[PDB]
Write a protein that binds this DNA or RNA. Sequence first.
DNA 1: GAGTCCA
DNA 2: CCGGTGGACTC
DNA 3: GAGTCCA
DNA 4: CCGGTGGACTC
Lengths: 338, 338
Amino acid sequence: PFTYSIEATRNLATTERCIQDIRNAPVRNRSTQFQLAQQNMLAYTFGEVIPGFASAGINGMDYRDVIGRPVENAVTEGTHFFRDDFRVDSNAKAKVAGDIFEIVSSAVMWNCAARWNSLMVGEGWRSQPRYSRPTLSPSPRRQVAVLNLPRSFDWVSLLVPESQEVIEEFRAGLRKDGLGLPTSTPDLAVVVLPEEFQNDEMWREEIAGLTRPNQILLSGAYQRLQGRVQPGEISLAVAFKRSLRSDRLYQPLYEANVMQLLLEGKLGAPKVEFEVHTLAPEGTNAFVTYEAASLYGLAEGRSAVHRAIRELYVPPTAADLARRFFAFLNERMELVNG
Amino acid sequence: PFTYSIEATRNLATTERCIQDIRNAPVRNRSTQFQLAQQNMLAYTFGEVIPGFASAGINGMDYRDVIGRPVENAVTEGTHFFRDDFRVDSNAKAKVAGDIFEIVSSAVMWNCAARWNSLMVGEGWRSQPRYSRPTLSPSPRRQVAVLNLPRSFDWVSLLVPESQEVIEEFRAGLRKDGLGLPTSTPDLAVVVLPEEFQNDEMWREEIAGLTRPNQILLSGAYQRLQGRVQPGEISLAVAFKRSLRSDRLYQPLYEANVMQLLLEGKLGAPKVEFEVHTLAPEGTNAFVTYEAASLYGLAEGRSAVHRAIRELYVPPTAADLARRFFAFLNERMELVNG
DNA sequence: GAGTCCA
DNA sequence: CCGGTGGACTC
DNA sequence: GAGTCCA
DNA sequence: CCGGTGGACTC
Ligand SMILES: [Mg+2]
Ligand SMILES: [Mg+2]
Ligand SMILES: [Mg+2]
Ligand SMILES: [Mg+2]
Ligand SMILES: [Mg+2]
Ligand SMILES: [Mg+2]
């Protein structure tokens, strides 16, 4: 569970355990002795807890201590089974804390979408835990999907095919001069739910925790929307970076620029909203780096130039994350006609 | 020396040793037990050798083994003196190997610069080791300075003050609207040598190795050119990356786009040549990523249309890096009147 | 299992 | 995916 | 010296 | 500054 439990750990089958001993099943060309079983770790620590939709104490706690609990639980497990032999490289803790920050934040946002969508189709406002009721007029057309995108992905594949064709034709032209314009991905996109899906229940159901089936339901969701999203209906992009270093700030900044050039410049979309979430900004003048104007915006020199990155948000608690997303939906969905 | 010598090591003062034991002198909030003494390492391994300008065997061995030699000499020193107590994090070896790849490459380019410059002023073509004599006609006005840029730096400080003035008025306008356009730095700039320095011998002396004094001379050179370079006199920008990961690609790509926007779009300079060098590209997607067109040029009625990054280069040997730079000088200096 | 690829 | 670094920078 | 920033 | 990583995909 969230608080480590000796008994609950004893109850695990060897394949569900957080530390996997691989001393006698080594990986070709790695010295790894113990693997941190990320998916096991989410199931044990967040099996019946989504932060922000759990107890008041978990919802209000320093979000860093929350995102850090899985690794801390896994090290206690490893120390119990293997004592002085237990060791893990800091680059395993780094990899796993990254994925954990992303998957858990994305799950908080998923439950916000479900509460939001439930209101929009006429079912009122679930009241535990307590959050401000949105004041925007409910409409099934204002529902949204939270898509944790896979490690490797190309966000263009979310678009209806006619929009993919406008992008393809643009690149065709660049190819004749030996140039390209590749697109990669944010960590997460929120999109307006396509009309064909506005009576499906799955988008309105809050999950109770990161059980292996809920992990898969959440991580596979993008496959359902691929091919179905209009350029204007990509409502928020999010990169997640557990901590910052000044040389790791650039991927979101570049991708945001490319998203703006293509969605706004080539497909008529309104302002693309892209933001970055971290738990440890400090040591960097990251807030200053992310004030940069869109390069596209500058190159066209239209009446209003916006930032490529709308904000660097540092969530202090899971409740805060949730409250911020609700306030964002409440404002951004005005723009979608009821 | 370049080949490890127990005897050379035995002769070193405690303060010159490649490994510095800090078990009794810990860094507050660090668990570090032994320090990799980067500057002592370069002095030991490269104190009498700049690769590409040394013996035929060093010039032509796999450059990855050339750049990995200091860390390998350090680990041999550590293992010898401390045996099984010798421990250092992979993150220590990552940091220092990145700085080795940068400093040694820069040094190879410094000697190239010096040999070019000797020819430019009419002193003929040094013959050992033998490189193809350049064909462009000599002129003191076609000498160049090789500038290994400091860790924290803003390339705009290289520019003559009237140019800095143009960038700053443009940014002042952007601030009214709550936007900025920050500049950082590539790792290295080659600039045209300013008129005032064009009969100074320091810019034509090849160094014999990376002794501490020569380390300082190379790392300090950018200071002598601050405030002196015309916008079209920044001839090449280099980003060094020892290995690649797909998330680490974006800092040079973004910066190259900012240099192009500001130098070509606001200051009238020709195409900004910016390239990346790695020893380990781990696949082919990196080459695809760097075929991206420069964003500013994609807006109708701006500067020319071309790649942000000209090329991802994987130097097989020191001699090859030397050769590529001489051939690049032979062509790009056509643009300068002699 | 072994190899490759991802970030 | 990101954290532990050697050296520079600040008082 | 003690502490922070740099990438 | 960058290397060691857990999981995904394929046979
Ligand atoms: Mg990602
Ligand atoms: Mg993702
Ligand atoms: Mg991320
Ligand atoms: Mg640098
Ligand atoms: Mg540099
Ligand atoms: Mg570099």
